[PDB]
Design an enzyme around this catalytic site. Sequence first.
Site, mmCIF file in Angstrom:
data_model
loop_
_atom_site.group_PDB
_atom_site.id
_atom_site.type_symbol
_atom_site.label_atom_id
_atom_site.label_comp_id
_atom_site.label_asym_id
_atom_site.label_seq_id
_atom_site.Cartn_x
_atom_site.Cartn_y
_atom_site.Cartn_z
ATOM 1 N N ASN A 26 0.864 -1.174 0.000
ATOM 2 C CA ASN A 26 0.000 0.000 0.000
ATOM 3 C C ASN A 26 0.909 1.234 0.000
ATOM 4 O OD1 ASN A 26 0.864 -0.692 2.726
ATOM 5 N ND2 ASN A 26 -0.410 1.037 3.381
ATOM 6 N N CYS A 29 2.291 3.584 2.044
ATOM 7 C CA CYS A 29 3.436 3.864 2.906
ATOM 8 C C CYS A 29 4.301 2.617 3.171
ATOM 9 C CB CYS A 29 2.981 4.554 4.204
ATOM 10 S SG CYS A 29 2.086 6.144 3.862
ATOM 11 N N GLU A 37 3.812 -0.305 4.433
ATOM 12 C CA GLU A 37 3.803 -1.073 5.679
ATOM 13 C C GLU A 37 3.098 -2.428 5.563
ATOM 14 O OE1 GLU A 37 2.126 1.652 5.074
ATOM 15 O OE2 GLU A 37 0.458 2.017 6.421
#
Lengths: 617, 617
Positions: free
Chosen positions: A314, A316, A318
């Site tokens: 996704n 960012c 993570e």
Amino acid sequence: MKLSDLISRWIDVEPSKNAQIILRDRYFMKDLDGNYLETKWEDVARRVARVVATAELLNPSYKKNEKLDRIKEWEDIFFRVLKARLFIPNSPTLFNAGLGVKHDLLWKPIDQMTLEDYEEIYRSRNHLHMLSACFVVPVGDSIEEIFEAVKEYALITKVGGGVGSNFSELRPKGSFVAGTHGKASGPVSFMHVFNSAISVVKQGSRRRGALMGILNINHPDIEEFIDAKKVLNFFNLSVGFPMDKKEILKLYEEDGELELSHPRSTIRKKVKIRELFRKIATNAWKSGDPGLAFLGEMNKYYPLYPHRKINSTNPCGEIGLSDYEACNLGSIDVAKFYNNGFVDLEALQELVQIAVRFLDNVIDVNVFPIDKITKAVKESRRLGLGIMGFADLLYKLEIPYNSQEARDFAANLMAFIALHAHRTSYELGKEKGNFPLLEISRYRTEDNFVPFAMGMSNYDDEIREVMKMTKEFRRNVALLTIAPTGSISNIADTSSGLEPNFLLAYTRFLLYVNQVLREKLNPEILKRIEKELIEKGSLKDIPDVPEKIKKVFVVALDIDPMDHLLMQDAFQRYVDNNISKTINMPQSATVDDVLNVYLEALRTNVRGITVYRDGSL
Amino acid sequence: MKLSDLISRWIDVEPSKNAQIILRDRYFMKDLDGNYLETKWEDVARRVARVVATAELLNPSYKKNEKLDRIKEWEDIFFRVLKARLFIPNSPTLFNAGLGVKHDLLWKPIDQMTLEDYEEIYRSRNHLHMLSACFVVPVGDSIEEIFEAVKEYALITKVGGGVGSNFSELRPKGSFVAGTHGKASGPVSFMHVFNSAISVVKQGSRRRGALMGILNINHPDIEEFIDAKVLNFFNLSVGFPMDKKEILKLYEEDGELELSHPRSTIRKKVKIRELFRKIATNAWKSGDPGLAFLGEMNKYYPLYPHRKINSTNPCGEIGLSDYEACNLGSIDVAKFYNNGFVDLEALQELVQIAVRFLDNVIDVNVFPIDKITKAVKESRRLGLGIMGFADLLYKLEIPYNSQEARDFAANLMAFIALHAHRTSYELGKEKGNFPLLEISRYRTEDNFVPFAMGMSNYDDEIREVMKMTKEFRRNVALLTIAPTGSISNIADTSSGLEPNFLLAYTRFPLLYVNQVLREKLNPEILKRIEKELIEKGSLKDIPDVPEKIKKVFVVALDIDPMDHLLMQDAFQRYVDNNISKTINMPQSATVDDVLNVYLEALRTNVRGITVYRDGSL
Ligand SMILES: Cc1cn([C@H]2C[C@H](O)[C@@H](COP(=O)(O)OP(=O)(O)OP(=O)(O)O)O2)c(=O)[nH]c1=O
Ligand SMILES: Cc1cn([C@H]2C[C@H](O)[C@@H](COP(=O)(O)OP(=O)(O)OP(=O)(O)O)O2)c(=O)[nH]c1=O
Ligand SMILES: Nc1nc2c(ncn2[C@@H]2O[C@H](COP(=O)(O)OP(=O)(O)O)[C@@H](O)[C@H]2O)c(=O)[nH]1
Ligand SMILES: Nc1nc2c(ncn2[C@@H]2O[C@H](COP(=O)(O)OP(=O)(O)O)[C@@H](O)[C@H]2O)c(=O)[nH]1
Ligand SMILES: Nc1ncnc2c1ncn2[C@@H]1O[C@H](CO)[C@@H](O)[C@H]1O
Ligand SMILES: Nc1ncnc2c1ncn2[C@@H]1O[C@H](CO)[C@@H](O)[C@H]1O
Ligand SMILES: [Cl-]
Ligand SMILES: [Mg+2]
Ligand SMILES: [Mg+2]
């Protein structure tokens, strides 16, 4: 201490004025005409707790005779943890919980709730009731698939999700197109169209679009991709490494060449892997993109690999997600678990158990805009439980972030959280049912599978035992992450994710000043230096500040790039998804310093890298 | 003379070297390796004739003992008229006929063809077998519908179709969006996304995207739309869904128009004269936007109000209902010149053949979208037109800018309309009526005629034919005049109904002179004046050129705007779809002159307007 008593300590601590402004601006629910239905964090806590508790309606272990009492109990515990801000779910859960539901049900007193009230809440959730922050969709190598994906991006953005794709399926620029005898535009050109679409779609004033775009290292257009950002303003970009990290590191050390090629193109090219890396490092040094995404490393620990495959994260980075998979996040503020020189592990274990149940319940009341997503999520039930407040917790413990002590501390803390989260997923599988794909996953088909590297904690043996147990019962494919917590850490008045504080005293668009430093530093020596601190952005060379304070109260740029990196490694050893971490670098850093970060990253257990050089942009 | 005799005069005449360049560049079919499968125009004629003749497989009037015979007869006739270049279908028919079919079937001698061979051709048409030039799709007022339409644009563009939409359903910029409590971007912002999408999609080297965007005059964003030209793939036209008389009356009274939208609360009043001057000013500067008289189109639409025309395709010549498409073809009327007259005997035979050809195209057509297949099957709209009209006037020694030419135009078009509709009657009788005949105005009314007439003594006969088609009719409408921008080049003749833009110029250094001018002008004088003719772009001011030559051999800029407009009117009186016509204006024209063209257009029978001021761009 019992969690119930920790709750009592924090539950009537009111959000700061800064937090309240953020809440009023984007979080408090309004009606159609724009009147506030909520005016206090307490209101959000009640709504969210109630909506998420209603998932217990589906709990097969509850007799219809007991459902009301049980649902009320969960609403109550959820409400108290939320109000105290010990745990907060990702923004979309806060924004969208209760959409569609009658306003006279969302905030009514819990003791007045009936079984019918809860069933009505459950039935009335509308198509906008989207509670998860993280999405990945595929972008197949055809006009039909590309433009369907553009539509998906728009639909996801509209309801408030962040979405990523690996664009490597798209044949390189200049490639033959048999249908038209033409030349293909290439993935980068198509990414511009995704960007244009997202320029006109958003979740009103609450949330603009946020995208991730990955292209794999061996794609013939990789060089164009690396330079793509200097347009693509809604994109973060990372270079994908589907192969083993050790294979890429070996190639680099041996000064080897990478074959750039694609299955639906004749376009072929050999490039020196060292040259490619210098190109990436050079662009990162200039502008901060692109990052590195160690997809091979994500798949090494993906319980459903190789039948399912992680191709992208996704926005960012993570969460590594399979195609059409989404994930909902929530974070525990570990700074609130400080007690007399130690972390209250008694209370923390209790909260981890509650938090995992909460996030798993979110799945049941979540509504997605696309049926393929609904299905992928139901089959895997991936969760993203993380932490925030870590930097402030170190402050209270008087531990410098840039030290082996802090990293050993981090590993043990994250190991403890992983242990109890996974134990909770076992218990939940037993109580409510296993995730449908358990039987085809490595928890089942394999001995000694563990979804992370471990190696820095005495909890390792106990973790191994629990992973063995989850062969039989497991509610969730994976459970942990560390997110940026860019908004929810501000709502909680605490430091963001695992990041060191960026500044001890500053102003955002007003005035923030580190509460832990206020409590340690003597107000005399604080009034003095205050100005200097906001101007220098550090305590490092402010004369007449106790050496003890300087070493503890370090900020991001006080901490060298390798200490940022090694902290990411300490956490990633006990995280089954990924981690959002910026490797901050001094303005004086060189392109070779960046390259050195990359090589060290290849030897550590990190699953991706983002660097940002101070003064870059 | 018989059509067979005229075929003999033309069939062994090969296309000019200029045309052959065009054919080799993008008409001749190639294999996957890029090797030519066709190297002469007759190869294209063979393939296209065979594919469209294959449609006779479906003819219910044929006994299987004769089906082979009949099919071969139609292939032969189609082949002859195509090879002779007496009639040529729109480019996508030439590009795409036969895609999917084994190469050993498309060109083998017709005496080697068996029934099984034709059934095989019919079966193996692939998803790219798209033979129509003109499309319209709706763009509904939601994110889902908008991006579904974006995808439809991409798919249509890939196969070489031209597509238009009316964007008026999209709520104005700033309008409330309930799902997000946000503000709408508005239609012009979304058109930019359609344009960005089409910048990366094309039918290979063959042809780039071509789009029409319309916004209705009473839309609150109309003023922004008028100045919208970033949108390089779009032609723009302002839509007038009301009656032309109504807007003329409002203009004459210096009245006001209320701008409003069903999904928006803000209404505004503007002077209609001010709006018109804004339009005229922009068109005077840049050639956009045009005017689309949608209300006039629906006035003559046999299915209105059951079905409704909201938009045209890119060059405006077809008014289409939502998801409707239309295939075109044009007769070169210049080749029908015979001893001071048009050969109506041969022309009638060709109209009958061309209508059957175009109706057959529908049966072997493959569209990318199911709703389009359905809309086309239900209506069977055709667009038979002409090209070579300007050159025909030359041969007849009739000046384009004269009442004589306009009277001739109306009579010629009336004759064609008469025999086209007669053929549709016969086809309805032989093959079956178009499914919506019963709810059309050909059935539900008395005296419905799909055009204004009034300039021909064929009117009474046309009235009789329309009455007959109450019982039998294969097609909802049959006629257009297209730009013929490519097929008129292939046929070595003037384009559509347009006057020649120039009599002489330099191809590449090759001097081209209009063939008819060469035949009529003394070769000595020609060589003398050639230099000045190219420099000045007209014969008008050249000394010692016979006055009669000057008056006959006029080019576009010799002809005043009102004479362009009135020629469009003469044709439109006998065309049931619309007409592509550029109203050329001298560089010295004013905005007031443009306004006067608009006002005269409202008084005439034209269904739309496009102007272009020389030297403006
Ligand atoms: C048609 C087309 C495709 N493409 C790209 C998009 C995809 O990445 C790739 C394939 O598109 P497709 O839509 O799959 O083209 P095709 O199926 O007709 O041809 P093929 O059998 O060779 O796949 O080409 C363009 O860039 N421009 C175009 O106009
Ligand atoms: C969500 C969204 C819609 N729009 C436009 C697109 C459409 O023209 C219009 C409607 O979008 P919709 O997708 O239909 O929005 P909605 O159904 O959630 O809200 P409503 O009930 O009010 O329709 O708003 C934007 O311009 N930007 C956006 O972010
Ligand atoms: N569409 C959108 N998604 C976002 C945005 N910010 C974060 N996200 C999603 O939320 C994930 C977690 O981000 P985080 O900063 O922890 O979000 P928070 O819950 O709002 O604090 C990101 O990786 C994105 O997937 C945004 O501005 N827009
Ligand atoms: N996609 C696309 N469509 C076109 C193009 N040129 C023409 N068309 C479509 O074809 C219709 C008729 O145009 P015309 O010039 O007569 O086409 P021709 O058959 O190529 O000579 C137009 O109204 C458009 O809808 C092009 O370059 N691209
Ligand atoms: N390729 C990327 N570009 C920018 N930020 C990224 C990228 N990948 C992950 N991130 C994360 O997104 C956040 C940016 O504010 C940080 O947490 C950072 O670690
Ligand atoms: N708004 C318009 N409507 C019709 N034709 C237009 C328009 N704008 C430019 N044109 C051009 O004029 C010719 C048909 O009128 C074509 O060449 C077409 O591309
Ligand atoms: Cl003027
Ligand atoms: Mg394909
Ligand atoms: Mg809507």
